[PDB]
Structure 1
Amino acid sequence: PAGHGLRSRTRDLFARPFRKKGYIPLTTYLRTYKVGEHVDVKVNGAVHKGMPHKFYHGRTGRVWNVTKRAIGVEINKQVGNRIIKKRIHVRVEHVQPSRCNEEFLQRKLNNDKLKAEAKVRGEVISTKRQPAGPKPGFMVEGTTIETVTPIPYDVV
């Protein structure tokens, strides 16, 4: 309304990708959701029911209520000077589970394992990542060194 209906400006947002038109692979239906997982809303052109508004294509949020044929997602929309946790129900064809927390949930166990292994021995460790910092010195075994000089200008 007010100049723009539900599916405006989506000449390309809602299209299928090239040579991925037609059928829905069964995996998008047999991936199962539980309340709390982080899922990515990406609308699917061909399934017209339960569709989310074009704003929500390409966001992530936590499932908050799961029903038959429908997932309840709870994502942040920024309006004014505040963040509203909007709650939408999207049909399962429009959501894919996210791999944002893949590394997190792997690393959680990878950490608790080393805190256990440290409790084994001298019970001091530090299970933190550090961003790539200064690289230490080393010798370079002198090889053939290629001299490069700026090229004279051939107009052609």
Structure 2
Amino acid sequence: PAGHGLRSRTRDLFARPFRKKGYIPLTTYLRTYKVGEHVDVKVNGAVHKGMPHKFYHGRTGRVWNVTKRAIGVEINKQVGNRIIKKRIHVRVEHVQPSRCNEEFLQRKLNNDKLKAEAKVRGEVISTKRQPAGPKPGFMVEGTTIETVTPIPYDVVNDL
């Protein structure tokens, strides 16, 4: 509407990947989604029902509703001054489960096990991540050292 149709400038966005057309694998269809889960939205151009608008391609959101052939996904949209939590329904073909919290979910289990040991031994620990920092001092044995020099300029071999 008002100058641009629903699928305008989606010539590359909604096209299928190279040599990856035709049938849709069964894995797409029997993945399980529950309310509160995180999913990435990736439109595929062979399925035209339940197709999300081009804005939500490449965005990750939460599952808030589950129907027979679709799920409700909550996605942030910035509209001027604020963020609007958009709620859309998308068929399962255009959605995949997100791995944006996979490293967090395993780490939470491990932190629970580590703090369990500190309970048994009576110690107090942290189990809190720390960014990569300065390396400690160390020694390297006397070995071969290769000398590096600036190379004389050659006109012919420039191309």
TM-score normalized by the length of structure 2: 0.97
Deviation string, structure 1 residues 95-132 (Cα, Å, up to 9, x no partner): 00011111000000010110101111133000111010
Percent identity of equivalent pairs: 100
- How far apart, in 1, do the equivalents of 2:142 and 2:61 lie? 54
Q: Give, in angstroms, the shift of residue 143 of structure 1.
A: 1.1
Structure 1 stretches (4+) deviating beyond 3 angstroms? Answer: none
Aligned to 2:83, the other structure's residue is in SS state: strand
- How far apart, in 2, do the equivalents of 1:98 and 1:16 lie? 20
- How far apart, in 2, do the equivalents of 1:142 and 1:132 lie? 29
Aligned to 2:104, the other structure's residue is in SS state: helix
Q: How many residues align?
A: 156
Give unmatched runs, 5+ long, in structure 2.
none
- How far apart, in 1, do the equivalents of 2:141 and 2:66 lie? 62
Deviation string, structure 1 residues 63-110 (Cα, Å, up to 9, x no partner): 000111101000100001000000000000000001111100000001
Aligned to 1:146, the other structure's residue is in SS state: strand
TM-score normalized by the length of structure 1: 0.99
Q: How does 1:25-104 map to 2 (within 5 A)?
A: 25-104=25-104
Aligned to 1:2, the other structure's residue is in SS state: coil
Q: Give, in angstroms, the shift of residue 40 of structure 1.
A: 0.3
Q: Give, in angstroms, the shift of residue 26 of structure 1.
A: 0.4
User: What RMSD over aligned residues (CA atoms) do the two structures have, in Å?
Assistant: 0.6
- How far apart, in 2, do the equivalents of 1:44 and 1:32 lie? 19
Q: Give, in angstroms, the shift of residue 142 of structure 1.
A: 1.6
